[PDB]
Structure 1
Amino acid sequence: TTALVCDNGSGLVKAGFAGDDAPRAVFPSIVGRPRDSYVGDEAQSKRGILTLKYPIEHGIITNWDDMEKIWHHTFYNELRVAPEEHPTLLTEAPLNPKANREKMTQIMFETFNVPAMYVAIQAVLSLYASGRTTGIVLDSGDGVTHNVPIYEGYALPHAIMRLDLAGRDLTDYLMKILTERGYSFVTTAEREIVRDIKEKLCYVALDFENEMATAASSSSLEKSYELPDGQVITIGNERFRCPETLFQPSFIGMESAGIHETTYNSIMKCDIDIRKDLYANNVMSGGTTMYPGIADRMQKEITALAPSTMKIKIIAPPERKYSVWIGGSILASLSTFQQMWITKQEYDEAGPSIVHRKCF
């Protein structure tokens, strides 16, 4: 028997087979209905004739009807497997309401007739993937950013921090600042171009003020980008100003602490005896941690905030845009895990509330 791993995010579904090194399928977490339902790439490419909805907001499922459509699409159209044949591992946001875990469980067993399933916390999976069971994860995706401190596979809920700024906000901000430069990025098609610019050319400056000074004095930091129609544009300080928003949320009008401060504050909410282990094991996860320079910059910022004697290590694996998924693949393909699944039998005997006993 082979397990499936489905990592449902605010912007992207990552899905595949346990044991694989990477997801087989990655697609937009979008359901389109006429202005009877389309999912993913097709929903996107038919936007003109459709109303589009994102069933997951800031990592939490908020539209169960549309979520069922995402899962149906995942099984039948992307992975192309019969769900009744596969134990299925799903992932969940930090601080996911208990009722949501039950609803995921009920839908899996009742709608999709899975023989077995499990729900794991996304940040814990990314930690596992990095080669640890203790550390603090900064997970930053398309819609939300969290700090999750974890001790021996257990997330410490009182110290979890949530920042409602992530990749989609950074894309919107890059569109704004490139428009201020004198370009015009406003439409949905122009948003896809800017997303590509963001993913290809942006970086986190080690010293932001110095970098702004460098950008002002020479073209040394400038990069050309060819637009779909052939026109070549210049991206300058926008390259590092865009992800600087993560450290300075006031750039997009948010009063919030930046990701260095949320990391520090998370650590400080934990018991003093475990803080040392957390500083030494700060793991970055998710697409919005992919910026070159982010690890170097976090190391510097955390050092400035931490006790002078504190050993600080930032771990940013090259594969971290899929580390949640990879952690799920490791867990779901592990021999010992085969006893951890909620079985169809157990669900029939106990109902959806079995999830709280079996997963956690």
Structure 2
Amino acid sequence: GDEVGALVFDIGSYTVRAGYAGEDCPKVDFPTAIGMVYYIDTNALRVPRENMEAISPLKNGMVEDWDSFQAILDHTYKMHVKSEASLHPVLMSEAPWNTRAKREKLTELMFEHYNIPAFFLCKTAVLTAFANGRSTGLILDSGATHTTAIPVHDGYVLQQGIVKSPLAGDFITMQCRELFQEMNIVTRSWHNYMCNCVIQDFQASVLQVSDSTYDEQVAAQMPTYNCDFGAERLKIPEGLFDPSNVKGLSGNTMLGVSHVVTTSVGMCDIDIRPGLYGSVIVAGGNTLIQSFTDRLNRELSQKTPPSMRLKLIANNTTVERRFSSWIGGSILASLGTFQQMWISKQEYE
């Protein structure tokens, strides 16, 4: 139970999490989108300065603009961490499947510019599994840029059974747009960013998932101007699980959350599928939708082989599910293996 004071970072697509190890809640949380003319903070989101382009370091779940990554890391170490970045280990949280070149570039940039004495990174599925308190399981993450069913066995991502669907930040940023326009309505990038923000607010406010196939529903009102929305709010979320249910705006084929889970479990080797089915874990931001886990559970039960247990984690009530990765990373640097299994300062040199 030794603690050295490591700063665990997690570069998310919607909000970056950071804070000292040994905490049960991310102390740092703010939008990750960088506004370059070069301001990265909630202030940047608020300040209406000269023409600004809204972009993010992550693209399809992979860091593309290293300049923005360096900028956000420096801004964090300067204002949020309020401590010099030369006497504190770092536990980076990469993507579900990171590449050799990306990890090499990250390690090189770190050890060169920041001179971190100890830098280590691990998968996100394993971190979430550790946060939930289980080694074997099936992580069902739905982030702002991708949703993936990552089967983990003994805290290691089974790269052979990974899957992915187009469910990303484009979930309702443009569907809810037309849904609202049905009744009625600094650069273009900033306008799109503000539109996405207000659409996410509308989502967290009224968007709800049904328990079964789409059906009539009473209307609900909410400000933005005020309007009363009928069952329209219950239509778009249907596309997350069943493609046949959404027949008009879901193309010809689509791997829903349930179908994604089934495919991920089927692609895995024998002797481990029972453990995966028994312990199913959900993650991401889209899981916060109302009645999401309920529909997921009551639907996966139908698409479940006989005598196969299905016991998920009932943590959706708490908002910390989205930060499960950060919780796992923080609790990771409080063990004895932190000194045994770790990358020191003279391993790469």
Q: TM-score of the superposition, structure 1-length normalised?
A: 0.87
Aligned 8 A contact 1:175 1:191 in 2: no
Shift of 1:7: 0.8
- 1:277-322: CA deviation from partner (whole Å, max 9, x where unpaired): 1111110011111112222211222222221322112224222011
Counterpart check, 1:335 vs 2:332: no
Corresponding residue for 2:39? Answer: 38
CA distance in 2, matches of 1:107, 1:253: 42
Shift of 1:259: 0.9
SS in 2 for 1:347: coil
**Change over 3 Å in CA distance of 1:168–1:73 after alignment to 2:** farther
Letter in 2 for 1:225: M
**Change over 3 Å in CA distance of 1:13–1:277 after alignment to 2:** same
Aligned 8 A contact 1:170 1:245 in 2: no
Letter in 2 for 1:175: R
Corresponding residue for 1:320? Answer: 321
Corresponding residue for 2:52? Answer: 50
Corresponding residue for 2:209? Answer: 204
Corresponding residue for 1:153? Answer: 155
Letter in 1 for 2:156: Y
CA distance in 1, matches of 2:228, 2:314: 29
Consecutive unaligned residues in structure 2, runs of 5 or more: 186-190
SS in 1 for 2:222: strand
CA distance in 2, matches of 1:301, 1:75: 44
Please, which moves more after superposition, 105-114 or 276-285?
105-114
- 1:87-114: CA deviation from partner (whole Å, max 9, x where unpaired): 0101111221111111111122112111
CA distance in 2, matches of 1:306, 1:43: 47
CA distance in 2, matches of 1:23, 1:176: 35
Letter in 2 for 1:73: H
Give the number of equivalent residue pairs: 333
Q: Which runs of 4+ in 1 moved over 6 A?
A: none
Letter in 1 for 2:30: F
Counterpart check, 1:26 vs 2:7: no
Corresponding residue for 1:354? Answer: none
Corresponding residue for 1:241? Answer: 235
Higher share of residues assigned helix = 1
**Which of these residues, 7, 11, 20, is aligned with residue 10 of structure 2?**
7
**Mapping of residues 60-79 of structure 1, within 5 Å:** 60-79=62-81
The two structures, once aligned, show a CA RMSD in angstroms of 2.0
CA distance in 2, matches of 1:325, 1:193: 26
Letter in 1 for 2:18: A
**Which of these residues, 193, 198, 223, is aligned with residue 193 of structure 1?**
198
CA distance in 2, matches of 1:57, 1:79: 25
Counterpart check, 1:224 vs 2:216: no
Letter in 2 for 1:65: D
Shift of 1:167: 4.0
CA distance in 2, matches of 1:316, 1:344: 40
**Change over 3 Å in CA distance of 1:167–1:265 after alignment to 2:** same
Shift of 1:188: 4.4
Corresponding residue for 1:358? Answer: none
Corresponding residue for 2:264? Answer: 266
CA distance in 1, matches of 2:14, 2:250: 20
Corresponding residue for 2:308? Answer: 310
Corresponding residue for 1:352? Answer: none
SS in 2 for 1:284: strand
Aligned 8 A contact 1:10 1:58 in 2: no
Shift of 1:327: 0.7
Shift of 1:28: 1.6
SS in 2 for 1:345: coil
